[PDB]
């Protein structure tokens, strides 16, 4: 019954429905992929933090890190980029500790930026879809009301069977608009929270490593 | 007119109207309270700038200000917290030409933060009212429409004469909601814009005084 | 009345009318849980400063704070961390005065960020509920009215008496949605302000303790 009403509509509303269906499919795919990447990242970060604070020497960690080069991800990168810088300047002239500390910090910030950019890839599309769907629904509703008014004005003493198509065509647009709008609006915030938590963890680790380097430099 | 519909309405509609009237009264009272203080602060700042630049010695201005230790407000405080630091630290270690500048700047920053915190009170209530108000008018309208439709369903006459008063009483909720919402939304932005200018003036004064102390220090 | 309307609804509308109750229960539980924690934090923050500024040798306060290891919250943690870092770093290197103050200041931001993270849980859920609920209500209403029209169109009876109850029962979802939406927005707005007020005191205390350490750094 409901689908039969769709099958007898005009072309513009059909195009609107196709656009909204495509938007919904894309949103679902993006959600599914992001929920896996952001779940793997957290476990990797927690495992590395536990290993780092376990109590092993730093040289062994550096050797193990340089063994698996060109595949590091997350905090493992930040430790690798800064540390290699620290030993590069210290053996150069062996003075001006502030320069050594600043050079160590700059590389860590550069490495952090890449990881955040990689983690924040496909998010704004969901926000755009969620903000834009209801107005397309409204456009469809306006077209339907226009056809209904034309039908009423066509024949004197119009019956229900000739006014029905416009009313039937009006409601489906709003329903599809809301259905496409809701999940994107949910997923936007849901993913932003995880990104913020990961950023905070990275900042804390960077600060603590910088503190250790600063303590060792001035002795 | 309005009184007849108010008396003929249900309990929930009356409660909604009372809540909205109370919100409007509170918003107007807050606006009236805040405007006078925000004006007096600007008047005092403009008055003090001319006295500072009038050409009187700084020592005599300090002597005048120390007699009002517990009544200072605004830029004067930012002045008073600065000089007292510059006098003290300079007595201990005058060799360092950079420590004294930071020691003076910290107190000015603290005082500016306290003053700015004191200036902004009760503003977020206006935003809360502006965000909340229409959601109660919608509730009132929906309840009224439901009661009208169920009353029409109960009777055996499909007449408009008994559905018209319900629709008439429904829209009062939306009217009063918009009436309560608009002025708060205006005043929120107006007061934030008012505060920003004072922030800029305080920053400029702090920069100029820091420049003067900086010039004096190296000599 | 309401029970009959709920019974006469379809499966999808009944399923929709349970998410909107779960949301309300969860939001109320979160609000009740968070208020007590915030009140306790405020009381402790206001109670520690009076003891700090009453006038007592800081060594005795530090020795007393050593007793409650792994149990400090609020400004006590900041004070303990800063003092420990200061004492440890001063003993080894006694030449550079600025490095000690820099390390002491750095040791406190980590603690402040940790407590701020601890005090800010479960608010985005309130935001999402408040942003989402009305759209779900409207979707339920549209679906119910579509079914009402489909049922009406089959029979030859065109009067309002057998179609009014369907429209009456299809307008409960919107009311439930708005009822779930309002408290979430109010609580969100209030709790954010409370968190900001807590943060400002910590910032001021950090700056003042850095200032009192700076004067001792240079003798």
């Amino acid at each position: 019954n409901i689908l039969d009403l769709f099958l007898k509509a005009s072309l513009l509303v059909k195009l609107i429905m196709l656009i909204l269906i495509g938007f919904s499919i894309a949103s679902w795919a993006i959600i599914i992929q992001r929920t896996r990447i952001l779940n793997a990242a957290a476990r990797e970060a927690e495992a590395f933090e536990d290993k780092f604070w376990s109590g092993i020497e730093l040289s062994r960690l550096y050797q193990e890190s340089q063994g698996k080069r060109d595949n590091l991800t997350g905090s493992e990168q930040i430790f690798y980029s800064g540390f290699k810088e620290f030993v590069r300047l210290h053996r150069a002239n062996s003075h001006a500790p502030e320069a050594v500390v600043e050079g160590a910090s700059r590389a860590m910030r550069i490495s952090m930026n890449r990881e955040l950019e990689n983690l924040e890839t496909h998010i704004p599309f969901l926000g755009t879809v969620g903000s834009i769907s209801p107005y397309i629904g409204l456009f469809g509703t306006v077209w339907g009301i226009m056809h209904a008014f034309i039908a009423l004005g066509a024949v004197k003493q119009a019956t229900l069977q000739m006014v029905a198509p416009g009313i039937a065509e009006a409601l489906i647009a709003t329903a599809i608009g809301l259905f496409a709008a809701i999940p994107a609006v949910m997923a936007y915030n849901r993913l932003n929270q995880r990104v913020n938590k990961l950023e905070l963890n990275y900042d804390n680790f960077m600060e603590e490593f910088t503190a250790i380097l600063h303590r060792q430099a001035f002795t | 007119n309005i009184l007849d519909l108010f008396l003929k309405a249900s309990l929930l509609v009356k409660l909604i109207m009372l809540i909205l009237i109370g919100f409007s009264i509170a918003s107007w009272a807050i606006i009236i309270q805040r405007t006078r203080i925000l004006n007096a602060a600007a008047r005092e700042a403009e008055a003090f700038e001319d006295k500072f630049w009038s050409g009187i010695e700084l020592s005599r201005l300090y002597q005048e200000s120390q007699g009002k230790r517990d009544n200072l407000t605004g830029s004067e405080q930012i002045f008073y917290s600065g000089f007292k630091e510059f006098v003290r630290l300079h007595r201990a270690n005058s060799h360092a030409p950079e420590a004294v500048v930071e020691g003076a700047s910290r107190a000015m920053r603290i005082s500016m933060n306290r003053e700015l915190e004191n200036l902004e009170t009760h503003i977020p209530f206006l935003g809360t009212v502006g965000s909340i108000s229409p959601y109660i008018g919608l509730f009132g309208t929906v309840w009224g429409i439901m009661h009208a439709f169920i009353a029409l369903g109960a009777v055996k006459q499909a007449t408009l004469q008994m559905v018209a008063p319900g629709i008439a009483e429904a829209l009062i909720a939306t009217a009063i909601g918009l009436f309560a919402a608009i002025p708060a939304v205006m005043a929120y932005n107006r007061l934030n814009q008012r505060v920003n200018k004072l922030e800029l003036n305080y920053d400029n004064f702090m920069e100029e005084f820091t420049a003067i102390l900086h010039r004096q220090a190296f000599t | 009345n309401i029970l009959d309307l709920f019974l006469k609804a379809s499966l999808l509308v009944k399923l929709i009318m349970l998410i909107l109750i779960g949301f309300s229960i969860a939001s109320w539980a979160i609000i009740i849980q968070r208020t007590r924690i915030l009140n306790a934090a405020a009381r402790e923050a206001e109670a520690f400063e009076d003891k700090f500024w009453s006038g007592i040798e800081l060594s005795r306060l530090y020795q007393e704070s050593q007793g409650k290891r792994d149990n400090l919250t609020g400004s006590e943690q900041i004070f303990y961390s800063g003092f420990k870092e200061f004492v440890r770093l001063h003993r080894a290197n006694s030449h550079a005065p600025e490095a000690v103050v820099e390390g002491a200041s750095r040791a406190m931001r980590i603690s402040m960020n940790r407590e701020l993270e601890n005090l800010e849980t479960h608010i985005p859920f309130l935001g999402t509920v408040g942003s989402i609920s009305p759209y779900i209500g409207l979707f339920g209403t549209v679906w119910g009215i579509m079914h009402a029209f489909i049922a009406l169109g089959a029979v030859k009876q065109a009067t309002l008496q057998m179609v009014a109850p369907g429209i009456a029962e299809a307008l409960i979802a919107t009311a439930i949605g708005l009822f779930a939406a309002i408290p979430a927005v109010m609580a969100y707005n209030r709790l954010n302000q409370r968190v900001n007020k807590l943060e400002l005191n910590y910032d001021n205390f950090m700056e003042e303790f850095t200032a009192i350490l700076h004067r001792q750094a240079f003798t």
């Binding site: 209801p134 409204l138 509703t141 009301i145 209904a148 119009a158 019956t159 229900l160 006014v163 029905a164 009313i167 009006a170 409601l171 709003t174 | 935003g127 502006g130 965000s131 229409p134 919608l138 309208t141 929906v142 429409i145 939306t174 919402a181 939304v185 929120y188 | 009305p134 409207l138 209403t141 549209v142 009215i145 029209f149 065109a158 309002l160 179609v163 429209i167 919107t174 708005l178």
Partner: peptide, 24 residues
């Protein structure tokens, strides 16, 4: 801070549709 209008517009459109369909 901001005023949302979509729910009111949707409710008004639905009311207009039902009154238009009921009257033949």
């Amino acid at each position: 801070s901001e005023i949302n209008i979509v729910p009111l517009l949707d409710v008004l459109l639905v009311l207009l549709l039902i009154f238009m369909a009921t009257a033949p």
